[PDB]
């Protein structure tokens, strides 16, 4: 068993590089525009297994103080979730600690499509 050596920011790069080919280059600029600005100086400096629910809470509280809009809040949470999904896929973590973290009472962007909803 490999220990929790992989820092989340190092992992976000490894996740992002391969994912540019699935999301598209212009879309990818925006995902990493959110990564290095929001997720890296918060959760990225932290180790992948040290990401507890408190860290996702402090992140969502920060988004309020940033004054980020309904779409931005949900999308940056989606990026964290998607990397943690792939971290279960790589068996780095047993459970996605952002899976219970969704957007508050608000919907998506009438501008920006790819609206994930049941």
């Amino acid at each position: 068993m490999e220990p929790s050596k992989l820092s989340y920011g190092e992992y976000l790069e490894s996740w992002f590089n391969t994912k540019r080919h699935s999301v598209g280059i212009q879309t990818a600029k925006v995902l990493k525009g959110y990564l290095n600005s929001r997720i890296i100086p918060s959760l990225g400096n932290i180790k992948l297994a040290k990401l507890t629910s408190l860290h996702m809470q402090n992140y969502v509280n920060s988004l309020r103080d940033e004054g980020l809009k309904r779409g931005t809040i949900e999308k940056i949470i989606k990026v964290i979730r998607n990397s943690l999904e792939h971290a279960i896929d790589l068996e780095l973590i047993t459970k996605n600690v952002a899976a219970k973290t969704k957007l508050p009472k608000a919907d998506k962007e009438e501008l920006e499509h790819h609206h994930h909803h049941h």
Side-chain angles (χ1 to χ4, degrees):
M1 300 64 63
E2 55 191 69
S4 313
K5 308 302 298 303
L6 182 57
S7 190
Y8 187 52
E10 304 299 285
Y11 177 59
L12 288 168
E13 298 300 277
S14 306
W15 172 84
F16 178 69
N17 280 287
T18 187
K19 190 55 55 60
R20 300 175 300 201
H21 296 264
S22 302
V23 300
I25 305 300
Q26 62 186 211
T27 304
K29 180 188 298 180
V30 191
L31 301 184
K32 190 177 184 173
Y34 293 150
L35 283 176
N36 55 32
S37 183
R38 289 286 64 219
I39 304 80
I40 273 65
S42 186
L43 308 179
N45 294 27
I46 308 175
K47 308 300 179 183
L48 178 52
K50 289 296 179 63
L51 269 61
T52 187
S53 184
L54 179 58
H55 295 182
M56 301 305 172
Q57 180 61 89
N58 299 333
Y59 185 77
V60 173
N61 294 329
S62 180
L63 311 183
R64 173 197 56 202
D65 289 85
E66 293 294 298
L68 297 178
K69 71 200 312 300
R70 59 183 181 195
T72 308
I73 298 177
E74 189 183 275
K75 292 184 303 166
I76 64 193
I77 295 299
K78 291 296 184 178
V79 178
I80 301 173
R81 293 179 64 139
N82 287 327
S83 46
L84 296 180
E85 294 289 82
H86 184 59
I88 305 169
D89 170 72
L90 304 187
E91 302 185 283
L92 298 171
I93 60 175
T94 54
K95 183 175 297 179
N96 184 327
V97 298
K100 311 305 177 183
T101 304
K102 60 173 183 58
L103 177 59
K105 293 182 294 294
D107 207 82
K108 285 58 168 164
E109 307 290 86
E110 67 296 277
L111 303 181
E112 303 182 277
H113 55 115
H114 301 269
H115 303 165
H116 302 291
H117 62 104
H118 171 65

